[PDB]
Amino acid sequence: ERIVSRDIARGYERIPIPCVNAVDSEPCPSNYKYVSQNCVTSPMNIDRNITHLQYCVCIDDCSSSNCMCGQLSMRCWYDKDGRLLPEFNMAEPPLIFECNHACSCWRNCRNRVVQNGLRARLQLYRTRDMGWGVRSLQDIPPGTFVCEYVGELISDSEADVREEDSYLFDLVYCIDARFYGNVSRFINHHCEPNLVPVRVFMAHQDLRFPRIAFFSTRLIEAGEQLGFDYGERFWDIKGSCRCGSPKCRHS
Amino acid sequence: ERIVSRDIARGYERIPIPCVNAVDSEPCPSNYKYVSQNCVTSPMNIDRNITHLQYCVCIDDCSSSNCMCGQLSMRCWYDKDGRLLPEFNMAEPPLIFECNHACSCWRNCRNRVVQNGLRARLQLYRTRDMGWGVRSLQDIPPGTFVCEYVGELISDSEADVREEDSYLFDLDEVYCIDARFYGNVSRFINHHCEPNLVPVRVFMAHQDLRFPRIAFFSTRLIEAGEQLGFDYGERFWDIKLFSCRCGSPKCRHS
Ligand SMILES: Nc1ncnc2c1ncn2[C@@H]1O[C@H](CSCC[C@H](N)C(=O)O)[C@@H](O)[C@H]1O
Ligand SMILES: Nc1ncnc2c1ncn2[C@@H]1O[C@H](CSCC[C@H](N)C(=O)O)[C@@H](O)[C@H]1O
Ligand SMILES: [Zn+2]
Ligand SMILES: [Zn+2]
Ligand SMILES: [Zn+2]
Ligand SMILES: [Zn+2]
Ligand SMILES: [Zn+2]
Ligand SMILES: [Zn+2]
Ligand SMILES: [Zn+2]
Ligand SMILES: [Zn+2]
C-alpha cells in the first residue's frame, strides 16, 4: 500500500486527507484543483444582503424551541455533540438552517455543525473495481457530519454543455466537482448508502443555493468505504453498478 | 473598572474582546451589530471568478524570491513570524497580495497573515475624553497584524446620502466600508496624529481591485495597555465641529 499523497487538501482541511494505492500503479489524481469551499466561474447572483437573513434572538445556546433557526429547520436536529437526532428523517431529509452572523447567539451555539467544516479522518484510496474511492480511517457514529459536496456552482444550462457529467450534483443549479472539488468528488455510489445528502443554509438563505452536507446514516466502521445514492437521473444515463449490495438496484 | 462584556465578538474571533468601563455608567455598546467579516446590504458585484485569480506555483513555503504572489506585492513583506519586514514603507504601503486557494502552495505558507485573522489580545474600554477606545492588553511587536477594518461595503453614492459619516473607511467607481451599523472591533479605534497603526490594502480570496480589504499593522512596539490609534486622514478632519484630542505633542488637527 503506497502513500501517493500525504494530503490531497494541502492543509485546507482540519486534518490531512492522504491518498494511498494498494491496487495498481496510478499516481494521486491531479486533473482537478482541490478547493475546500464552493467556488464560481461565471457569476452566480447569490443574495448576500445581510438584512435578508432570518435569524434568532436567543440568550442561551439555541437549545430551546424558541430559536427561530430551529423553527426554520422545523426543529434543531442537532444534539450537543453535533449529531443528528434519532428522529431525523434520513429517507426524506428536511432543510437545515444553521445559526448565522445576524443571530444574537454565540459562535459555539448548538445549531452550528456544517459551518465548522470537515472533521473525520478520511482517505482517498484505489478500489479494485470503481477507480478511486473514499474511506473513513475511524469509526463515525450515526448522524455525524462527514463532508460537504464541494465544487463549482453552475447553472443547469452550463451543465448541459459540459462534456463530463460524472461529478455533477443537482441542487435549477448544480455543483460540478470535475475541475474544482473537495474529497467528495471521489465518493462512490452505493445502493444501501452509509451517507445521506442534506440541504443546508448557513451564511446566506438564498433558497436556490443549498449547500450539500453528507451525514452518516449508521455507524461507519474504521476502514469502511463511504458511499451515497447518486439517484435515479444519474443511472437513467449511466446504466452497471458494482456496489456489491445484496439489495443493489442498478447491477 | 466594571467588566461589561466577556466578549463583544460573541466567540467569532480566535480571541475574546472584553469591554470594560472604569470611567462612567455606560453599558457595553449595542447600537450596532458585531460582524467579524465584511458584509453587504445592496449587492456588490465583487469579481469572484476563480479563473481571474493570479496565483503562485511555489514548491516550498513561499519564502523564496520566486513566489509570484510575493511579486504582485513587490516582494512578500512577511517574515517567519507573520511580521512586516523592517524594509516595509509604513509611510507609503504597497498593496499586499496574499496567497489564495488557487495557488499550488499549502495553507500554512509564509504569505498568509491577514487571512488567518485577529490574534492580538484587545479590549474595548471607556476613555475619559473620547468615548470608547480600543487598547492592547499585550505587547505587540512592530509590523504585526492587529485587526482588519470591517463593516458594510457600500458605494461612494450610498455613503454620501447617509447621516452618520463617522465610521466610514474610504477604499480607492469608489467604495467605502461603513462600520456604523455592522462592524468589528476597529469601528471603536480613535484617531491619533502619530498612530501606532497603519492601514494596508490587502487581497486574499479575490483580487477585484475595487474592493481592497483594510488591515491594520503596528507601526512600532505597542505596549500592554496602550490605546490603538490610526490616522483617519485629512478628508475626515476637513469635514469634522470639534478639534483633535489625541494629545500628541505633534498633533496636526488640534
Ligand atoms: N457503484 C458504482 N459502480 C461502478 N462504478 C461506480 C460506482 N460508483 C461510482 N462509480 C464510478 O465513478 C464515477 C463517479 S465519481 C466517483 C469517483 C471515481 N471512482 C473516480 O475514480 O474518480 C462514476 O461515473 C463511475 O465511473
Ligand atoms: N482624536 C480624536 N479627537 C476627538 N474625537 C475623536 C478622536 N478620535 C475619535 N474621536 C471620536 O470618535 C469618532 C470616530 S469612531 C471611534 C470610536 C468612538 N470613540 C466611539 O465611542 O464610538 C469621531 O467622529 C469622534 O467623535
Ligand atoms: Zn437560536
Ligand atoms: Zn444559535
Ligand atoms: Zn440562530
Ligand atoms: Zn448497487
Ligand atoms: Zn508562492
Ligand atoms: Zn503561498
Ligand atoms: Zn500564492
Ligand atoms: Zn491629534
Residue numbers in the entry:
A (entry chain A): 976 to 1146, 1153 to 1220, 1224 to 1235
B (entry chain B): 976 to 1147, 1152 to 1219, 1222 to 1235
Authors' own words:
SET domain methyltransferases deposit methyl marks on specific histone tail lysine residues and play a major role in epigenetic regulation of gene transcription. Methylation of H3K9 in humans relies mostly on members of the Suv39 family, namely EHMT1/GLP, EHMT2/G9a, SUV39H1, SUV39H2, SETDB1 and SETDB2, as well as then non-Suv39 enzymes PRDM2 and ASH1L. Here we report the high-resolution crystal structures of the methyltransferase domains of GLP, G9a, SUV39H2 and PRDM2, and propose a structural mechanism for substrate recognition.
Mono-, di- or tri- methylation of H3K9 constitute distinct biochemical signals and are established by distinct histone methyltransferases; G9a and GLP are mono- and di-methylases, and SUV39H2 di- and tri-methylates a mono-methylated substrate. Several aromatic residues line the GLP channel occupied by the substrate lysine leading to the catalytic site and contribute to methylation state specificity as previously noted for several other HKMTs. Post-SET is fully structured only when bound to the substrate peptide, or to a small molecule inhibitor, but the density is incomplete otherwise. (2) A loose conformation when SAM or SAH, but no peptide is bound, which may also accommodate non-specific sequences.
